[PDB]
Amino acid sequence: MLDAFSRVVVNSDAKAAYVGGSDLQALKSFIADGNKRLDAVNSIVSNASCMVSDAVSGMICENPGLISPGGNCYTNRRMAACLRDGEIILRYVSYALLAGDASVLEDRCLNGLKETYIALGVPTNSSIRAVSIMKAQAVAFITNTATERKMSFAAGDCTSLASEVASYFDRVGAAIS
Amino acid sequence: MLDAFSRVVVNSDAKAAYVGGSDLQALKSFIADGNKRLDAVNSIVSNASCMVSDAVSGMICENPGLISPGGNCYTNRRMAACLRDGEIILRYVSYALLAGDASVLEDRCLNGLKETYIALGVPTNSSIRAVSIMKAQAVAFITNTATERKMSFAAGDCTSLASEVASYFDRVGAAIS
Amino acid sequence: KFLGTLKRSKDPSGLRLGFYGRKADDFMARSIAMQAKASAAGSGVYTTQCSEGASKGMAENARTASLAKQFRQAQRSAREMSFDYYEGRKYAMKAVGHICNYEEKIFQQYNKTAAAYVMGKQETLLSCDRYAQPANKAEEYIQKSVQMQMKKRSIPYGVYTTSCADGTVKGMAENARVAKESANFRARQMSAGAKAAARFNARRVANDWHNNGCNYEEKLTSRFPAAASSVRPTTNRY
Amino acid sequence: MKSVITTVVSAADAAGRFPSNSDLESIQGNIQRSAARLEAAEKLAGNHEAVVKEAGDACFAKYAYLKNPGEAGENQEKINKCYRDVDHYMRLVNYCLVVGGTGPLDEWGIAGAREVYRTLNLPTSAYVASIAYTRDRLCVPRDMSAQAGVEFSAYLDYLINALS
Amino acid sequence: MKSVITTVVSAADAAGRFPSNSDLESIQGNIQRSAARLEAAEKLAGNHEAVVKEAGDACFAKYAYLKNPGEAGENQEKINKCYRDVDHYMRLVNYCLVVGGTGPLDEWGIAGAREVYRTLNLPTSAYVASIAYTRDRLCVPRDMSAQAGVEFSAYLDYLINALS
Amino acid sequence: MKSVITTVVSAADAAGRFPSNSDLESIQGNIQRSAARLEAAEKLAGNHEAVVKEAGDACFAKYAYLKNPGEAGENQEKINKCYRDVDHYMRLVNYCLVVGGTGPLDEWGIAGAREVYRTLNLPTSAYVASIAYTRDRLCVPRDMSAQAGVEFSAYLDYLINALS
Amino acid sequence: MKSVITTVVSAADAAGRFPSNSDLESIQGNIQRSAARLEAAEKLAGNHEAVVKEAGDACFAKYAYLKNPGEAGENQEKINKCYRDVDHYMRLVNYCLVVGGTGPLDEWGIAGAREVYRTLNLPTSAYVASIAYTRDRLCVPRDMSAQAGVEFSAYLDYLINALS
Ligand SMILES: C=CC1=C(C)[C@@H](Cc2[nH]c(/C=C3N=C(/C=C4/NC(=O)[C@H](C)[C@H]4CC)C(C)=C/3CCC(=O)O)c(CCC(=O)O)c2C)NC1=O
Ligand SMILES: C=CC1=C(C)[C@@H](Cc2[nH]c(/C=C3N=C(/C=C4/NC(=O)[C@H](C)[C@H]4CC)C(C)=C/3CCC(=O)O)c(CCC(=O)O)c2C)NC1=O
Ligand SMILES: C=CC1=C(C)[C@@H](Cc2[nH]c(/C=C3N=C(/C=C4/NC(=O)[C@H](C)[C@H]4CC)C(C)=C/3CCC(=O)O)c(CCC(=O)O)c2C)NC1=O
Ligand SMILES: C=CC1=C(C)[C@@H](Cc2[nH]c(/C=C3N=C(/C=C4\NC(=O)[C@H](C)[C@H]4CC)C(C)=C\3CCC(=O)O)c(CCC(=O)O)c2C)NC1=O
Ligand SMILES: C=CC1=C(C)[C@@H](Cc2[nH]c(/C=C3N=C(/C=C4\NC(=O)[C@H](C)[C@H]4CC)C(C)=C\3CCC(=O)O)c(CCC(=O)O)c2C)NC1=O
Ligand SMILES: C=CC1=C(C)[C@@H](Cc2[nH]c(/C=C3N=C(/C=C4\NC(=O)[C@H](C)[C@H]4CC)C(C)=C\3CCC(=O)O)c(CCC(=O)O)c2C)NC1=O
Ligand SMILES: C=CC1=C(C)[C@@H](Cc2[nH]c(/C=C3N=C(/C=C4\NC(=O)[C@H](C)[C@H]4CC)C(C)=C\3CCC(=O)O)c(CCC(=O)O)c2C)NC1=O
Ligand SMILES: C=CC1=C(C)[C@@H](Cc2[nH]c(/C=C3N=C(/C=C4\NC(=O)[C@H](C)[C@H]4CC)C(C)=C\3CCC(=O)O)c(CCC(=O)O)c2C)NC1=O
Ligand SMILES: C=CC1=C(C)[C@@H](Cc2[nH]c(/C=C3N=C(/C=C4\NC(=O)[C@H](C)[C@H]4CC)C(C)=C\3CCC(=O)O)c(CCC(=O)O)c2C)NC1=O
Ligand SMILES: C=CC1=C(C)[C@@H](Cc2[nH]c(/C=C3N=C(/C=C4\NC(=O)[C@H](C)[C@H]4CC)C(C)=C\3CCC(=O)O)c(CCC(=O)O)c2C)NC1=O
Ligand SMILES: C=CC1=C(C)[C@@H](Cc2[nH]c(/C=C3N=C(/C=C4\NC(=O)[C@H](C)[C@H]4CC)C(C)=C\3CCC(=O)O)c(CCC(=O)O)c2C)NC1=O
Ligand SMILES: C=CC1=C(C)[C@@H](Cc2[nH]c(/C=C3N=C(/C=C4\NC(=O)[C@H](C)[C@H]4CC)C(C)=C\3CCC(=O)O)c(CCC(=O)O)c2C)NC1=O
Ligand SMILES: C=CC1=C(C)[C@@H](Cc2[nH]c(/C=C3N=C(/C=C4\NC(=O)[C@H](C)[C@H]4CC)C(C)=C\3CCC(=O)O)c(CCC(=O)O)c2C)NC1=O
Ligand SMILES: CCC1=C(C)[C@@H](CC2=N/C(=C\c3[nH]c(C[C@@H]4NC(=O)C(C)=C4CC)c(C)c3CCC(=O)O)C(CCC(=O)O)=C2C)NC1=O
Known about the structure:
7 chains; A: mainly alpha; Globin-like; D: 164 residues; globular; binds phycoerythrobilin; binds phycourobilin; methylation (chains A, B); photosynthesis (chains A, B); chloroplast (chains A, B); thylakoid (chains A, B)
């Protein structure tokens, strides 16, 4: 759809700006951090069955009101849609981490998604809790501060993607709020 | 469906075998030839409307039988349906060279292609003549023996691609016959 | 006074079940279509039964075919806007095989979801038009004749309808003719087993939810599946 | 839009699927030849007033019939709009050296070009041949680098190819 | 099948459209990292008899209940078929390092795996955990190159993901 | 084909319906003005060699650029085919004065005219303007009857309209 | 509706196409015989109370069984509604002499006539035979002009044909 190579052209097409080397060097840092950017996205797709079993178990650890029958999320088909909705939001941020841009998150997920949940009856507060576990484990997966799981890497600072992924998950959270 | 990477894994599939250290030195030519293969494929897709306008004009050069009224190919929608059929051999013989294998060519056009042409009254002798024009112009474009078009290249051989592309237009010439 | 709270009635000629419900309704049916685009591409192929163009590029010209269908279904009149709401509700009961507490409890309040299910689930089987190939001259002729009554359904009388208009400009007039003739070839082009699975799939829409009770119309499917595959009883006015 | 981002993040959504390493591989070819692609962009940004004027009456030399009344070039007010028309083609080809593919060309300046021009009695044969003047108008080790002209020249004969 | 050839030459046919430069761009990412992808293939071709035996009783250490009669591993005739079963998974993952995507996995060894195993009373929990033994069983600068393990390891946790 | 027979016997079949008096009425307008329509047909049958030559170099006066090599009119062998090309347009317009509608025009000589000409580098702007020379080239009480030119002239500006 | 306007401006929209001269020809047959069609309309407007009464008991002579209780004509309250019923057929046939085709007949008084009458135990055989009384009830050089009865009589046997 739209990405960081195409973000710098749509403000320049809106001004008919012939693009020269005053804004290329911010993309040249994106050019030079190509392999650093792909270094974070392969630690996040390699444990994606762990995170979908970590978050909504950690969401049912903090609040047992949903597994009570007559609540929201309790029975067997009902929990199948919990892993259904919970996995697909991890698919979209992994698209958004690669583009340098959450534009592909913003159109395929973030249109109208909030009040479909209350036209169903999803509590929006429990979905802020599940996305915050998915925010907190993913920033522990793009670095080496996991409990047992240490992949092999090349060292140095990579906080610049941790500020990128933390600016993506709250964009999910403010969309469903 | 299947590139020249993967001709050597479906026959090892039939023996419960794996691709051990004896069969892939032609593949280690085939990955070391990544940028000589790339320097042939810009030279075809740059002048793609030359080659469909050189083939059908050279076909109506040698044959004024179709231009007669009541023939196969004389009128307006009809010659417009030729430039449908004139490019689609060139369209998939690109991917026969891009993948390296004509298996992407074998199911996607060559299934049922000959029997539709007698069901549409298309004479196959003008079809096999126009594809031999398309072979003769493509081997002068992957090499440096065109008339006026002189693209920039690095020197060396690409007669290994000239034998690959010669084994392609014969394969479509055997399937429309 | 009575703070104008004075409210008479009005004709919306639509769903009118909430502004919040209306903007909800196109999102999940987009997700129903993207569910069903992911069964077409279960294995990661844009599979050859879906065609939406010609030889020459013209899918931006077939954008203007489909956005006309985006527009002509929006400018439907009040009879056909309301008839298609209720016939699609019982057809969504026909579209799902099982009987739920869930699926029709979307599909009878919401109608785009019912409409994107009778289009979406049925396109990733191979009981549609122009995809099942007839064997002989005898099968294609009654395949042709049941299409004539689907002309007679969408053209009920001397007026031609607004909804088989398939074009607006001179460029897309003959583009719509050469679009189907490439797609008619891509039925008999693509495979040998998926088109063999089509003729068993053609009884999977006609026998079970189109001609119940008529054995004659039941063995017409099992003797002629490709003739029973463009019978198109999903009344989409096409 | 049209780029490799429009291929692989859309096909993974069309498969309902993760960004696997098929998708992560496809953008690596941007990185090794963006330096090849983006010294071509400031050439026609540096010549954005230079080669619009040299292409108009090179076209109007071989299309000199337009100056009669009742046609596409009956006054200078047409020619004042005509250097706008080649430059508006020339804006988009500059942008396709930045996005990689032909992104700003097809959804803005290519699709439905064959519903406009001779309806406005504008000759389409002069439109491709003004561009085909500029297609061969290059010199690869002298104007730009040798790695820069093969993105430029492949987009200009595409403009004749996309009008076909 | 499933590759980038299955994306772009099929989507151009699904649009009824030319192989435009969106389709020509998507295969360039094959070329720059096929050398990254295809020294991983001869590792498990070189270890096609080495790591089948080390994965079976690593699975049968943590699944040691099978040896009773009336279950999935009641005799050595089951275990003679069981090293066939992990190797038949192991054949296909080798081939997906060649075609790029997961081409031979989904249409041959993945789809309808959840209609077979416990119907034949075969435990699916041992099937992913035999594979998850081999998923972390790698060492990226020591066994292969560092550019080779990230195609290998992303396919093995996919095998647990595709059974989900 | 395209006539009033193609309207009403096809719409009664498209309704699955009898030839009712809506269909019987539509052909009565053929009868009262076939005498208006069919003294125009023997004019351009009488001038089938007269006005082909007067339209070619009236077009080639205002399109005189063609005679260079590398274009559409580089030799007399093109011009020997070019008087064939205007006459093949001129054959069909004669036949549309007989069938009533534009029957032989659309299915034979109009549809897909915009996929042929500039692909064969033939200028479409000269094609409509050779016809637009002959469009105003009439004199209604002097050449034919006054009831004959309004079928003739409405088909010739249609040829510019159908190329739009 | 149903007229020649419903043919050709709808088929040009169904082709996505201009009103070409196939569409402009079809309405000329309205003009030369609207004078033939529209002295028939004021006959049954002048006899809108005259021939409703002469058709009811001409039908009730050959259908005289209705006057028993438990049937369609058990009281005068049925017969007061019955002269309304033939006149409501008679209103629409007057309007089809104005619109040309059978416009007000099919969408208002014909379609689904075979879902109503014997469900309301009304005999359909008396409905066509009351109309077939009036079908032959004409005298073409004496009541109206000779050019007026052939639109009238072709609509009345159509009413038996449309109930078939
Ligand atoms: C992006 C497109 C673009 C262009 C094409 C140029 C347009 C252009 N090119 C040339 C530069 C030129 N330089 C040469 C010299 C050459 N020596 C050789 O060995 C070759 C045969 C040939 C390469 C073409 C020629 C023939 C011209 C065109 C004629 C001219 O000088 O004006 C000049 C003259 C000034 C100069 O030398 O720079 C101009 C205005 N600018 C642009 O922005
Ligand atoms: C395709 C999959 C595949 C495999 C996994 C291996 C399987 C395997 N790996 C090792 C090689 C090994 N090498 C190490 C050494 C290491 N040093 C470190 O700094 C790291 C922590 C660790 C990387 C794992 C360890 C721990 C093992 C496994 C234990 C063993 O030696 O058998 C050995 C022993 C012989 C050898 O050293 O090669 C075997 C059979 N072969 C295969 O074909
Ligand atoms: C629109 C339908 C319509 C009708 C049918 C009439 C109905 C009608 N027709 C006739 C007129 C009639 N005129 C004739 C004379 C005729 N001389 C011949 O050479 C023929 C055989 C025959 C033509 C039928 C006959 C037989 C009748 C019917 C019997 C009668 O006089 O009532 C009369 C008697 C008064 C009159 O003469 O006008 C009436 C009420 N009015 C209507 O509005
Ligand atoms: C707190 C709120 C907030 C904002 C208001 C923006 C403000 C903002 N926008 C841009 C910069 C930009 N912003 C846009 C986007 C747009 N240009 C348009 O034509 C549209 C109106 C709009 C959405 C499509 C683009 C395309 C650029 C880069 C080029 C340009 O300036 O036009 C920049 C420069 C650095 C950057 O790219 O982030 C900043 C600070 N950012 C924020 O954090
Ligand atoms: C009582 C219920 C209960 C649970 C079910 C777990 C679930 C759980 N895990 C984490 C938090 C986390 N969970 C993981 C995920 C994983 N860690 C691993 O060792 C694996 C590799 C991987 C699962 C496959 C990571 C990396 C963190 C971050 C902190 C940490 O390293 O533990 C959090 C905190 C989230 C936050 O801070 O917002 C919770 C609630 N914890 C609980 O208290
Ligand atoms: C498509 C598959 C693919 C990958 C998985 C990565 C794998 C990867 N990461 C790094 C290399 C690196 N990666 C990081 C980033 C990190 N390192 C850490 O320890 C943290 C876990 C993480 C923070 C997000 C840093 C800081 C370097 C060092 C850069 C260097 O070595 O020059 C390198 C060396 C190349 C370089 O960046 O210069 C490679 C190949 N690249 C790829 O192309
Ligand atoms: C009687 C009418 C007549 C024609 C219309 C042309 C058409 C034509 N061209 C070629 C042959 C060819 N045609 C081309 C194509 C091109 N060459 C260029 O200089 C352009 C760049 C490009 C068109 C855009 C090429 C590259 C060859 C191969 C030999 C050559 O270089 O000329 C052939 C021989 C085919 C064969 O040998 O199989 C024919 C018949 N020749 C004729 O005799
Ligand atoms: C985004 C919107 C959305 C919905 C409204 C539902 C509706 C729905 N269910 C199924 C899919 C299914 N639906 C059922 C139906 C049922 N199972 C039972 O036991 C009940 C009796 C009955 C109603 C609940 C079954 C058994 C399947 C799996 C097999 C099949 O595809 O038919 C599918 C096909 C694709 C898929 O598997 O998701 C869809 C669209 N699912 C969605 O994704
Ligand atoms: C060759 C393919 C073929 C079929 C699959 C069926 C299905 C079918 N039946 C009808 C149309 C009809 N179908 C029936 C059939 C039945 N109504 C009943 O009460 C019985 C249960 C059942 C079998 C006797 C009837 C009575 C009609 C006419 C009324 C209607 O339009 O529904 C139509 C619309 C037009 C048509 O008649 O074709 C179609 C597609 N008919 C076919 O020609
Ligand atoms: C941003 C996208 C964009 C384009 C690709 C071009 C294409 C284009 N040109 C014109 C419109 C025009 N284009 C031309 C140009 C020419 N006529 C000729 O025959 C010569 C070959 C050439 C001059 C060198 C002229 C003269 C008009 C005006 C036509 C008129 O008003 O009659 C129009 C109609 C709207 C308008 O007036 O702008 C469009 C879409 N213009 C654009 O805005
Ligand atoms: C080419 C694709 C392909 C696969 C992916 C596997 C999967 C697979 N395994 C078995 C069949 C089997 N698979 C196993 C294996 C095991 N049982 C366990 O519980 C252990 C975890 C594991 C041994 C390590 C056994 C023991 C059988 C035989 C079951 C039986 O016959 O009862 C079958 C049924 C047909 C057959 O017998 O082959 C299939 C499809 N086999 C294949 O041919
Ligand atoms: C029966 C339907 C019918 C038509 C409507 C015309 C249209 C038409 N003309 C040509 C083909 C041609 N048409 C022309 C004519 C001209 N070129 C110009 O630029 C001048 C304006 C004009 C002369 C006055 C020429 C010169 C060719 C040959 C082109 C070539 O071979 O390069 C062709 C390609 C096949 C052929 O050579 O015939 C077609 C379909 N010819 C037909 O058979
Ligand atoms: C505008 C369109 C229009 C029509 C075409 C007719 C047709 C028609 N007639 C009746 C209804 C009727 N029609 C008749 C008439 C007759 N019964 C007979 O057997 C005799 C042959 C004949 C008298 C001469 C009677 C008696 C009823 C009343 C039936 C009842 O109420 O039981 C109804 C039901 C609604 C109503 O009562 O009006 C309709 C639609 N009426 C219309 O409004
Ligand atoms: C809403 C009206 C509408 C459109 C559609 C597009 C029209 C359109 N479709 C396309 C292309 C197109 N058409 C299809 C077919 C079909 N569609 C799918 O999303 C899947 C999974 C399908 C298979 C059955 C596919 C797969 C593509 C390729 C790109 C894509 O959509 O992912 C392309 C670009 C490809 C090219 O460059 O040639 C365009 C412009 N525009 C519009 O205005």
